[PDB]
Coordinates of C-alpha atoms and ligand atoms in Angstrom, one line a residue:
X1 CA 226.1 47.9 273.2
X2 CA 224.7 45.3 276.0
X3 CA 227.0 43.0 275.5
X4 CA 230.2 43.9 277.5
X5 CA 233.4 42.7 275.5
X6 CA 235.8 40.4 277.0
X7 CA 239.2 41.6 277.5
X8 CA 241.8 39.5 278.6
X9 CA 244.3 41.3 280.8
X10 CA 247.3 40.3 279.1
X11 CA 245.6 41.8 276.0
X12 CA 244.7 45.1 277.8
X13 CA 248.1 45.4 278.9
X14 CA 249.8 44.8 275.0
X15 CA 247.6 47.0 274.2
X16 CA 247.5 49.7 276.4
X17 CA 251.2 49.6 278.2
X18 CA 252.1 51.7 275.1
X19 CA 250.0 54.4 275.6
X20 CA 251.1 54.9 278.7
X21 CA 255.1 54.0 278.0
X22 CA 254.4 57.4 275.3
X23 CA 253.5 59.9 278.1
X24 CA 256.5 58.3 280.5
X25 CA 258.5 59.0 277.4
X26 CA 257.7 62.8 277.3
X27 CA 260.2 64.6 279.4
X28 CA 260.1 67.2 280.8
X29 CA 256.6 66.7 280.7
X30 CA 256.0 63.4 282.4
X31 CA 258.0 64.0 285.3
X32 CA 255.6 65.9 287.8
X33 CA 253.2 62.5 287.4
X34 CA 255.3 59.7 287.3
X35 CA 254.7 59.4 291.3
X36 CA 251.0 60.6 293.7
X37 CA 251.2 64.2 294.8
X38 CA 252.4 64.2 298.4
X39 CA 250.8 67.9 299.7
X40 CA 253.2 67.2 302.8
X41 CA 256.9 67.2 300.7
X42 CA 255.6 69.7 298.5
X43 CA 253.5 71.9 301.5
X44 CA 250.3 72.1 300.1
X45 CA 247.5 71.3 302.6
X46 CA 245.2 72.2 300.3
X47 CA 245.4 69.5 297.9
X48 CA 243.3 66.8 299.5
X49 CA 240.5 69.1 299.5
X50 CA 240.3 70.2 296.1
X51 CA 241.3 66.8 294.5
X52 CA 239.1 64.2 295.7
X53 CA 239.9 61.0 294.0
X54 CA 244.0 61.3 293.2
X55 CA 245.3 59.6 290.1
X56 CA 249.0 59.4 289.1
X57 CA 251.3 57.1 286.3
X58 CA 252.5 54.5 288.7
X59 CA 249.5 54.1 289.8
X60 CA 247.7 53.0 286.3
X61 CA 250.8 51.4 285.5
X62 CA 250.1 49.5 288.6
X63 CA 246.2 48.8 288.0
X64 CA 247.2 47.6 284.7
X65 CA 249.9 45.0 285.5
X66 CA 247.1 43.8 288.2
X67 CA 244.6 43.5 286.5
X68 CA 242.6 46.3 287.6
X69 CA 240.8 47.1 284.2
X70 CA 238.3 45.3 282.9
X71 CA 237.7 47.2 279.8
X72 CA 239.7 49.8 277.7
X73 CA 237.2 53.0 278.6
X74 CA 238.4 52.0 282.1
X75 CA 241.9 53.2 281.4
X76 CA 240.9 55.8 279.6
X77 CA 239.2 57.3 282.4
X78 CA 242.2 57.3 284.9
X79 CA 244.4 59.0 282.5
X80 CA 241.6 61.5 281.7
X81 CA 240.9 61.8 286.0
X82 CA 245.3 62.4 286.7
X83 CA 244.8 65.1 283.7
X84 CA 241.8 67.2 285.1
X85 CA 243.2 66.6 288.6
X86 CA 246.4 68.9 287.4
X87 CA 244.5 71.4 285.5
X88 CA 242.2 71.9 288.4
X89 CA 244.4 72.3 291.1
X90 CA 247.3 74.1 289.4
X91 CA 247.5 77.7 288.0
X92 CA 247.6 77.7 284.1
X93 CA 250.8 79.3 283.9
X94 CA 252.7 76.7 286.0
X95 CA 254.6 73.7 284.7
X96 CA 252.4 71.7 286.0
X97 CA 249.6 72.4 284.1
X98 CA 251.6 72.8 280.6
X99 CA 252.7 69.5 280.8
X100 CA 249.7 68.1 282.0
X101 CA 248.2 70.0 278.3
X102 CA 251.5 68.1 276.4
X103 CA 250.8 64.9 278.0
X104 CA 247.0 65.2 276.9
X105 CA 247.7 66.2 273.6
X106 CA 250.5 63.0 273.3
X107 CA 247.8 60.6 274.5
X108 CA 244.7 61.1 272.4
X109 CA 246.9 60.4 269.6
X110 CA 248.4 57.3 270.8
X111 CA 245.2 56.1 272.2
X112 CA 242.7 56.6 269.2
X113 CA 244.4 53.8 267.2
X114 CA 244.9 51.4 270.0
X115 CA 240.5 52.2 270.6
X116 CA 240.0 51.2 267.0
X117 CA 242.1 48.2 267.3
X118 CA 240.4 46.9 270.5
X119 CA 236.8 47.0 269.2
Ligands
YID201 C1 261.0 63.1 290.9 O1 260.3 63.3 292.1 C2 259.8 64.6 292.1 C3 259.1 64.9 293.4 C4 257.9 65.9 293.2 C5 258.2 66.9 292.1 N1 257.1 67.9 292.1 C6 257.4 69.3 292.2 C7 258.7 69.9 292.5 C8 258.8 70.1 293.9 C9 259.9 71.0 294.2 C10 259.6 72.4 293.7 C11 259.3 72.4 292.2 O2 259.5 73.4 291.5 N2 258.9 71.2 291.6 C12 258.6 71.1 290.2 C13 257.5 71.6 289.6 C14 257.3 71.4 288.2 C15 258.3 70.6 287.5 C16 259.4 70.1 288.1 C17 260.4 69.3 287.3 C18 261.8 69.8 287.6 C19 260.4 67.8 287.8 C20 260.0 69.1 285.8 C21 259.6 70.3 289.5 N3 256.2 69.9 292.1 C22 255.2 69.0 291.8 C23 253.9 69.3 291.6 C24 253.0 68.2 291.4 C25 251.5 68.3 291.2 C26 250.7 69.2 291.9 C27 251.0 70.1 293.0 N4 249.4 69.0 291.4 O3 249.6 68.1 290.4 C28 250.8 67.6 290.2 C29 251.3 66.7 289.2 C30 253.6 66.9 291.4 C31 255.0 66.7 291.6 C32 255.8 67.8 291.8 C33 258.3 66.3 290.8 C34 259.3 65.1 290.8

């Protein structure tokens, strides 16, 4: 459409705090992303290199209790950004990556529904 709907962002957070509470709820899984990567703790120069634009669950949990998001695809897009992130700078057989392919698989079911229920 041309006609961008207006979210409130005490609306986009009822709506889409949820979504993201499921993937904090996954553990294992959620553990590796609940903070940023820091490639100097963990050693690994590389990572700035490879991943450009960093994206972790604080910080959308952040963007969202500010405010940051103006429209639900908005979200959507920073979960989807922390997800490719991890399965392009890890190996597939690491933890890292299955996890990142749990928490993937856990949020395109919780966030279909909420998607219906904002449009
Ligand atoms: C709580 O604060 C901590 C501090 C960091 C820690 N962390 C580990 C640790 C480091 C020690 C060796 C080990 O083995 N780690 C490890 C690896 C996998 C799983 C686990 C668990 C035991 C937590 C499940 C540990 N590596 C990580 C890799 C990444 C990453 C990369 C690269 N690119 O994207 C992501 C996402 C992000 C965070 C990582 C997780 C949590």
């Amino acid at each position: 459409s041309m006609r961008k709907k207006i979210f409130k962002p005490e609306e986009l957070r009822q709506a889409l705090m949820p979504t993201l509470e499921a993937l904090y709820r996954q553990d294992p899984e959620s553990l590796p992303f609940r903070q940023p990567v820091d490639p100097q703790l963990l050693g690994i120069p590389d990572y700035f290199d490879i991943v450009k634009n960093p994206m972790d669950l604080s910080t959308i949990k952040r963007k969202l209790d500010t405010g940051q998001y103006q429209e639900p695809w908005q979200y959507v897009d920073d979960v989807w950004l922390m997800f490719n992130n991890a399965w392009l700078y890890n190996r597939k057989t690491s933890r890292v990556y299955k996890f990142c392919s749990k928490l993937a698989e856990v949020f395109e079911q919780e966030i279909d529904p909420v998607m219906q229920s904002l449009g």
